[PDB]
Design a protein around this ligand. Sequence first.
Ligand SMILES: CC(C)[C@@H](NC(=O)[C@H](CS)NC(=O)CCC[C@H](N)C(=O)O)C(=O)O
Ligand SMILES: [Fe+3]
Length: 329
Amino acid sequence: SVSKANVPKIDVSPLFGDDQAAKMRVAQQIDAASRDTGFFYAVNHGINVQRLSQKTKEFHMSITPEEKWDLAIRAYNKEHQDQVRAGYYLSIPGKKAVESFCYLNPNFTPDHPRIQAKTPTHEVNVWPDETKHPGFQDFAEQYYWDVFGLSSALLKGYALALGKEENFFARHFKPDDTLASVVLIRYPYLDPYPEAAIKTAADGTKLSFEWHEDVSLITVLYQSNVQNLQVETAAGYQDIEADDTGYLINCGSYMAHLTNNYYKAPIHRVKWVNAERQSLPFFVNLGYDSVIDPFDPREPNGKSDREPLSYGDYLQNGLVSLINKNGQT
Ligand SMILES: CC(C)[C@@H](NC(=O)[C@H](CS)NC(=O)CCC[C@H](N)C(=O)O)C(=O)O
Ligand SMILES: [Fe+3]
């Protein structure tokens, strides 16, 4: 049968401090995980994930069909042509079980020059009515900055792991322009569960979401305590154990590009499980014009012939491709 992936628990707390050797020891653990299955759990991360789960559940479980249409992305509501990324992603009973709510940088307002210029991938977030959902927007925006702070620290770990100065990635990850997103995903319990919402992998495994590489620099994921993720290895898919106290971390394909695939973007998929649960990714994206010069840590001179890829073009191309390959979520 199906083996279990080695997903080490890494105490990331030194990355918030000034003990440089302790940070190097974290970096070594990140390097090792990134060169093996590509996943690790960040522990001692400083975020109240219990409050995150509770507030998210309160939102998912209290929003009405009317509110969902009013917040829907353009894939579900033609009136909302400016909502490609941010908003509500509806379930379709009998056909599509998952639903979700995506939001972007709270600093994208009508005053922001990327909104004024109508640059692709930048949108103003949409929110439900505050009195129907008291505290939800406050919680969600606070959470964005809490996970931004964790992610910055993790990026310092990744930079050190690759032999760079600690700000090599983080200097491009800024509150004024980050394209990072939070998605609050509900995977429901359904009885009967409609087979139309279940995909069958080549290997026979029943899936809710097919294999993919993440469109991100890194991905910083909370999930409730229901095992579902699998990572591809040469010997087949391996189960990633759940941990509802930590953050599951992995690289996306922008990291693979800039490291000449030294830190691969691990291919992974979501098993079908008939259980009520949450999947709350934070996709760590840079700014639209951010460019990291590629390098090859395998080569003595570190030189890579790969082209510098602008983050915004990478993101626009990647989000569209992922919809085409794995379906509109
Ligand atoms: C694997 C999990 C992270 C999750 N899947 C996902 O979140 C999948 C694959 S990483 N991600 C996406 O569809 C991209 C959403 C991007 C977001 N709307 C945005 O505009 O930035 C799941 O639980 O299905
Ligand atoms: Fe993913």
